[PDB]
Amino acid sequence: KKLMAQIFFGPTYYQRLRHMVDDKIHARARGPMQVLTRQPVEGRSRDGG
Amino acid sequence: NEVFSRPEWMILTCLPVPPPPVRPSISFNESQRGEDDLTFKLADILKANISLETLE
DNA sequence: CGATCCTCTCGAT
RNA sequence: GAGAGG
């Protein structure tokens, strides 16, 4: 069925930026602890909290 | 406070030596040391204290 | 003696 | 330390 509204449609130059979910997802349920503070480590790369 | 704080206690006669969990080691390469600044400074104060003990 | 938060990556000592 | 993200 036809849409009641007519849509503005045509080509537009789009850019694929870096920043992709899969490079950002992070989860921690216990893991490596810092030596001094005995607190979770920092950063996704180190399985941080 | 007669019990907890006296002004004679604001001057240091005996300095408390912190344990290793306060100033820990461990590096990136297991061939060299890797000490804490606090440890290096305490070694520095000792060098200064033995020097004073010698001279006296 | 203060000077947003949190998050990432990088290189170099 | 710099470069960045909201």
Nearest CA in chain A to B20: A36
Please tell me what resolution, in angstroms, this structure has. 2.8
Name the residue type at position B54.
T
CB A24 within 8 A of CB B13: no
Residue A23's nearest nucleotide, by CA–C1', is C8
Quote the tokens at residue B16. 């408390």
Cβ-Cβ contacts under 8 Å, A35 against chain B: 24, 26
- The one-letter amino acid code at A24 reads K
The residue type of A36 is L
Q: Is the Cβ–Cβ distance between B46 and B15 less than 8 Å?
A: no
The tokens of A10 are what? 């045509």
Method: X-ray
Find which nucleotide's C1' atom is closest to A49's CA. C7
Q: Is the CB of A26 under 7 A from strand C?
A: yes
Element (H, E) at B47: helix B37-55
Contact A41, A32 (CB under 8 A): yes
